[PDB]
Write a protein that binds this ligand. Structure first.
Ligand SMILES: OC[C@H]1OC=C(O)[C@@H]1O
Ligand SMILES: OC[C@H]1OC=C(O)[C@@H]1O
Ligand SMILES: O=c1cc[nH]c(=O)[nH]1
Ligand SMILES: O=c1cc[nH]c(=O)[nH]1
Lengths: 293, 290
C-alpha cells in the first residue's frame, strides 16, 4: 500500500482558497487532483534548464517521448515545473531559503492533489572532498557546518532543530541502481550543507576571506574524517522537511571538483555538462526499475 | 572611491572565474564591459530586473535590444545601459550572497569607482498599507538585532548590518519629490524562511496559533521593524565590509497583521512592484543631473 501525503499544519484544511504564490497556482483556479493526482516521483534541482532537460530525458526513457514540455509555472519566474506521466520535475534555485519556499508549496500541492506513495529526490551539484571530480554522492546523512545532523530554524524568535537523516533503504537502492548503470563512480557518504558558497565552504576566492590555504585544508580534512564526502547548500532543509511530513526522500549530487585541490570551477563546459547528467541517469534508472514492478 | 575587496588572494590569481555568472577574466574584458558603471541595482526576479533596465533606459533617453550578459547560465540575469547595471539575485540569503561575492569582484576587476548598490525588492509589511515602500534604515535578524551571523571554518562570526544614513534620507527625499505612493524609513527583518520563518499560518508546517503570530509581529513593530524579507542582512553586511554605499528599497505586498497569503489581483501586484523602480529611477536621474 501507499500512504497519502500529509501536512503538519491544521490551518490549511480551514482555508477557502490556498494560493501557491511562488508557483502561480491556486486551488480556486486549478484542479490539483486532475493535474497532479497520479504523481509518484518528484525530482528537484537548482536549475530550471537542467530540470527541463531532465523531464525530456525521462520522457524518452519511459517511452512517452515523440512533443512539447510546457512549463507548468507559467505566470511566474521563481521556479519552473514539468510533468510526464508519474514524474514531476521542479527547480528550486540556490540555497536553504529558496528550496524551503519551494518545499512548502510543493508539499501542499501534493496534499491538495491527494498524491500517495510519493518519493522525493534532489538531484544537484556539489563540491567533493577527497573524490575524483564527476563522482556522484548519495547522501546518507545531511550535516551542518559543525558536522551535526541537525537543521536549525528560528520560529517566532525561538530556535528549533530537526533531525536530518535520510531513508537508509532508499540510499542502498540508489547505490544498486548506480551499480547497474556502471557509468561513473558513486559513493554513499555524508553531505555538509552551508549558507554560503565562498567563506561558508572554506573557499579562498570570495570577495571576502580572512583565512589561509592551511586553515581550509585543516577544516576540509576534519570534515572528511567525520565522514563527509561532499558539500552543497540544500540537503539540510530538504531532509528535515521530508522527515517532518513522513516523506521518503533522497539526495543525489555530482561533484564538480575536488575541494582538497582547489576552489574554482574550471573544467571545460562540455565536461561539466556531462557531469550534470550523471545524477539524472542514476535517478532515471531508479524510476524505470520502480515502474517495472 | 574605487571598489575594494577584503581578500588578498584575488590579486595573485592568473584568472578569476565568476562561475554563477558564466563570466571569466580570461573570456571577458571587464574594464571594457563595466568600467563606467556607477549604479548597481539588484532584485530577486530576472523579469523584474529586465523591466527595470528598460524603464531606466527610457527615463535617461537611451531607448531597443537589452541583452542578458549572463547568457550561458540561468542562475542569474544581468543587463546594462549606460552607467546602470541591473542584476537578479534569486531568493534567500545564500542566493544573494553568491551573487554579491561575484558582483563585487566583477566591479573590482572593472575598477569601477563611486558606485552605489541598491536592492529593489518585495516584502511583507507590519502595520502599513499594502503598496507602501520601505527604505531600510537598519537590517535586523529575527530577534531584532542588527547582526548578520555566518559560520566560517566551523566557527560563528557576526558583522553589523547598519545602512548608510545619508543615503536613506536622500532616497526619502526622492520619494517625496515623486509624490506617488507612501514611503517610510524603518527597520527590516531578514529571515531564512518565508513561512514558519515569518510567522505564517499557511505553510506545510505550523505548530503555533494566530495569537502567537500577532504578538511576535507586534513585538517586531514595537522594536521599529516595518517590513519583513529575505536578503537585507547579508546585503548590508557585505557592502559594509567592502566599504560600499548601499541601500534597500522594498515595496510591501501585504500587511502581515491582516494576513499571510498574497491575494491581491495580479494587476495591483504588478503596479506595486514598479514603485521601488520609479523611486530608484528618481534617485539615479538626480545623481546624474548634479
Ligand atoms: O552553485 C551552487 C549550487 O550547486 C549545488 C548547490 O547545492 C547550490 O545550489
Ligand atoms: O517572495 C519572497 C521574496 O520576496 C522578497 C524577498 O526577500 C524574497 O526573495
Ligand atoms: O563546491 C561546490 C560546487 C557546487 N555546489 C556547491 O554548493 N559547492
Ligand atoms: O511577506 C513577504 C512578501 C515578500 N517577500 C517576503 O520575504 N515576505
Amino acid at each position: 500500500h501507499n500512504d497519502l501525503v500529509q501536512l503538519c499544519n491544521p490551518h490549511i484544511a480551514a482555508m477557502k482558497e490556498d494560493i501557491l504564490y511562488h508557483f502561480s497556482l491556486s486551488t480556486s483556479t486549478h484542479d490539483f487532483p486532475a493535474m497532479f493526482g497520479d504523481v509518484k516521483f518528484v525530482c528537484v534541482g537548482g536549475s530550471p534548464s537542467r530540470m527541463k532537460a531532465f523531464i525530456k530525458y525521462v520522457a524518452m526513457e519511459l517511452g512517452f517521448a515523440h512533443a512539447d514540455y510546457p512549463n507548468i509555472c507559467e505566470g511566474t519566474d521563481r521556479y519552473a515545473m514539468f510533468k510526464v506521466g508519474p514524474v514531476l520535475s521542479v527547480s528550486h534555485g540556490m540555497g536553504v531559503p529558496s528550496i524551503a519556499i519551494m518545499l512548502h508549496e510543493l508539499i501542499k500541492l501534493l496534499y491538495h492533489a491527494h498524491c500517495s506513495g510519493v518519493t522525493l529526490i534532489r538531484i544537484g551539484t556539489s563540491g567533493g572532498i577527497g573524490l575524483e571530480p564527476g563522482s556522484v554522492v548519495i547522501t546518507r546523512q545531511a550535516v551542518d557546518p559543525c558536522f551535526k545532523p541537525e537543521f536549525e530554524q528560528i520560529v517566532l524568535g525561538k530556535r528549533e532543530v530537526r533531525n536530518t537523516d535520510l531513508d537508509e533503504q532508499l540510499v542502498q537502492e540508489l547505490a544498486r541502481c548506480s551499480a547497474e548503470l556502471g557509468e561513473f563512480p558513486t559513493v554513499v557518504g555524508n553531505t555538509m550543507c552551508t549558507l554560503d558558497f565562498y567563506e561558508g565552504q572554506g573557499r579562498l576566492d570570495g570577495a571576502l576571506c580572512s583565512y589561509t590555504e592551511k586553515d581550509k585544508q585543516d577544516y576540509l580534512r576534519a570534515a572528511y574524517a567525520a565522514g563527509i564526502r561532499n558539500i552543497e547548500m540544500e540537503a539540510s532543509v530538504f531532509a528535515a522537511m521530508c522527515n517532518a511530513c513522513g516523506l521518503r526522500a533522497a539526495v543525489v549530487c555530482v561533484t564538480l571538483l575536488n575541494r582538497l585541490e582547489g576552489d574554482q570551477i574550471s573544467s571545460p563546459h562540455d565536461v561539466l555538462a556531462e557531469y550534470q547528467q550523471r545524477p539524472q541517469r542514476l535517478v532515471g534508472q531508479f524510476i524505470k526499475k520502480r515502474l517495472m514492478q
